[PDB]
Amino acid sequence: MNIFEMLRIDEGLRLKIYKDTEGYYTIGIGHLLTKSPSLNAAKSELDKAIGRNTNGVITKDEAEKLFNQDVDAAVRGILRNSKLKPVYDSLDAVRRAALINMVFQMGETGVAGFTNSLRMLQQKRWDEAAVNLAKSRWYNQTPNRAKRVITTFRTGTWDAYK
Numbered sequence: 001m002n003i004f005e006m007l008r009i010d011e012g013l014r015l016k017i018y019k020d021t022e023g024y025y026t027i028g029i030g031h032l033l034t035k036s037p038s039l040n041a042a043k044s045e046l047d048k049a050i051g052r053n054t055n056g057v058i059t060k061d062e063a064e065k066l067f068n069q070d071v072d073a074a075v076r077g078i079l080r081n082s083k084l085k086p087v088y089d090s091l092d093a094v095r096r097a098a099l100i101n102m103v104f105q106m107g108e109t110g111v112a113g114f115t116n117s118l119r120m121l122q123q124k125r126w127d128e129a130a131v132n133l134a135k136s137r138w139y140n141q142t143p144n145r146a147k148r149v150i151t152t153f154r155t156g157t158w159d160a161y162k
């Protein structure tokens with residue numbers, strides 16, 4: 001298991017524009033297009049992202065290419081983030097993937113907002129961090145995915161994904 005297989009399980013793969021759990025236009029493996037209500041604004045973001053006129057449909061290769069960019073960008077955003085970096089540096093390989101997953105889902109700003117949980121993770125207080133992480137909109141809105149990520153932080157294993 002690795003970050004790509006983990007996120008592929010969590011996000012799925014869709015080759016036609018769709019709406020995410022929040023009602024936003026998305027495509028591929030969790031690639032957010034726009035938060036705007038307009039489908040045309042989404043087709044336009046999509047063509048710009050891909051470099052061709054797509055008419056709302058992409059190929060497997062194109063989805064995977066966006067996926068590779070998004071993972072790379074999540075990692076880079078964590079390392080540039082003054083709040084996230086020290087947490088990331090402190091974690092083992094498995095838990096680092098858990099943190100990348102949360103950033104990929106909610107953005108670096110959102111994750112950097114879980115102040116108390118981050119402090120707990122850095123301190124290696126696994127059980128306490130798991131309890132604090134669950135007291136969130138994130139956990140309440142997407143409980144199955146949240147539980148998998150939370151179990152990954154708690155155990156430092158890929159058990160929840162196998």
Ligand SMILES: [Cl-]
Nearest residue numbers: 048049066069
């Ligand atoms: Cl893009």
Ligand SMILES: [Cl-]
Nearest residue numbers: 142143144145
């Ligand atoms: Cl879920």
